[PDB]
Structures are given as C-alpha cells and as structure tokens.
A paper describes a structure:
The 2.8-Å unliganded structure was solved by molecular replacement using the model based on the cryo-EM structure of the GMPPA-GMPPB complex. In crystal, VTC1 dimerizes in a manner similar to that of GMPPB, with the dimerization interface being solely mediated by the C-terminal LβH domain. Two inter-dimer interfaces were found: the first interface is between catalytic domain and LβH domain, and the second interface results from side-by-side arrangement of two catalytic domains. The first interface could be of biological relevance while the inter-catalytic domain association may be merely due to crystal packing. For structural description, one VTC1 protomer (chain A) was analyzed by the dictionary of secondary structure of proteins (DSSP) algorithm which defined the secondary structural elements. The VTC1 protomer has 7 α-helices, 7 η-helices, and 30 β-strands. The catalytic domain comprises of 14 helical elements and 13 β-strands (β1–β13), and the LβH domain consists of 17 β-strands (β14–β30). The central β-sheet of the catalytic domain is made up by nine strands in the order of β5-β4-β1-β6-β11-β8-β12-β9-β10. Two small β-sheets (β2–β3 and β7–β13) lie near the C-terminal α-helix (α7) of the catalytic domain. The LβH domain has 5 three-β-stranded coils and one two-β-stranded coil.
Residue numbers in the entry: 1 to 357
The structure:
Amino acid sequence: MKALILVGGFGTRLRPLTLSFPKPLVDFANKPMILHQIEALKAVGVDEVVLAINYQPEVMLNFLKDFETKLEIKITCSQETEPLGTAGPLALARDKLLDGSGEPFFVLNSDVISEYPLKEMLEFHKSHGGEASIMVTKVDEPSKYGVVVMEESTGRVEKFVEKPKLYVGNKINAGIYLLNPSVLDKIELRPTSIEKETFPKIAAAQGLYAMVLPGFWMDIGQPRDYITGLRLYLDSLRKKSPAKLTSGPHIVGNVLVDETATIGEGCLIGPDVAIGPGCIVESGVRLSRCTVMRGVRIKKHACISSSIIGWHSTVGQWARIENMTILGEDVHVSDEIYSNGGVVLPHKEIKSNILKP
C-alpha cells in the first residue's frame, strides 16, 4: 500500500523555524511532523511514502536515512520544478504510486495533525466502492475555507463551495485522502488543485465520498494554529493515553516531557507545554502554552508563554517571552530581555527588547 504526503514549499509561514529544517521536519510535540504521519501510515500497511516537495530534498537526506531504518518503511522524494499545487504532484509521482494491484493510495497534508483513523477510512472507502474518499472535519469559521456540500444520508459529495459568505455547512477538507488509481488519470502534469479542479470531476461522476473525522484536527501550517494544534493534541493524549503526559506538583494542565529533558526545582510548567529531548529548564521557570524544541536551555526565573523556542536556543535569566514569539535555531536571548511577539532569525543574539516585526 502506497502513500503520498503533500508538502509543497519549504514553508514560509513557519519562518524562522523552517529556515533551518523544512516543514515536514519541524518538531511538533517532540516529534518531527513527518513521524506523526508515517507512524500512522505504517499502522495500516503502507510500505512506501512519497514526499511531494517543492524544495531540493538533499537537505533532509541524512534524517530520512535513519527514519527509514528505524520505522522500516520506504521514503522517496518527488521534487517539483514549479509549484504543482495539491493535485499536480499526484501526476508527477504517478509512477511511484501505481503498483499494479489497483489498490487505493493515501494522500496527506503534511501540516495536518489528527488521530488518523486510517484503518476506519479503509473500510469506509471500500464499502461505497467510489473513486475517491476524503476526510471531513467541522470548524467554527467555514467562511474562511472551502465547505463540503455532501449528501449526509450517503456521504456522496455534491460540490465544494469556496469561502461561503452565506452558511452552507461547516464541514471542510481535513486533508486526508484515499484515492483509487483511476484518479491519477484525471490530473495533468500542470499546476492543478485537487479540491477545486480534481474533486469537481469526481463529484460529477458521483464517485466522491466524505467521511467525518472522529477526533481533533488542526492544520499547524502557521504559528497561531500550531499552538492551537498542540493543545488539541495534548488533550487527545489526556483522553487516550494519559501515561504519556507528565505529572507532579510543578505541572498544571497537559504537559509532554521528553525523558532526556531536565526540569529544575521550583518551576511551574503548564498548561499545554511540550518540552523536547535534551532541554535544560533551570530552577523557577514559568512555562505555559509554549513549545521548547530539541536542546534549548531556559535559564532561571524566566517566564515563557504562547511562544515557540527553536532548537538549541537559550533564554536568559528573568527574561519575559510572550505573545506568539518565535525564536529560530540557536537564538541566545540575554537576561531580563522582554519579547512581545519577537520573530528572531536563526543564530542571532538578542541583547535588547523586541516586539512584533
């Protein structure tokens, strides 16, 4: 069983984190986003996963080598010259997706975090015998998305309404696709969109079916939705496997701590914090609604809220970091510095206060 992961560009919207490692390798909940998906794809019997990227994948060849051996799965890159959209890459890598068994293949948005009911979706797709199945999830602002209009008694999709000024529903594209090989005959090797060009073709032939996604969903493509997705994901661990969440008198809410991380005495971590491997959180540190990536040090008495601290960064003593601050890799914030939404490029030294760029 084959699978495709739609990456596209390196991800400007996640700068400066993506300036060091492209979008599918940025950490989410102590794991690179690629792991969350491949672990899920492997659990349904996927043996090869094609990565549809826009950048040169040589920058991530050393990481994927190790991930292929540990996860026992084939990862093949499929780079595009010009941006082919979300359906275009399906044609560019049609040779790597067709294996002759006529079996359907999975397609995933590289920035979608969920519980991935891929087993439950396999049985859904084979029941109605349609050409393509997509996952659907409900949101609060469907006017900002393309809303699905589906025959809810059967699941058959009639049409997609892009950015409806008037309410026609609240179910949107959840980014999880299950497509038969025949779909690849409806996509030319040009920039085409699967939701606005390919799906209407299948929606006309009455071969498009939608399955409501049971569980949380979030596209962490941008920083605001990244923090939101971390909260929804951590509460999923609270509901599913609470043993993975940490606990103690210094813990409020749901906190995920890597076993190789150091937590100093007298801290207060939470709610909704993810601390990565090799992190040194010194004594008396306040952390909430933030992500601390691999190898960053938070010196004593610092307070961090609603922020993302890039790999191997260093927050000085009594520093104040809040309001959607994003430190890149290897950023050294000095003591007592105040960041109100600072966006610091990698390897920089922050010696004075910074605000929103």
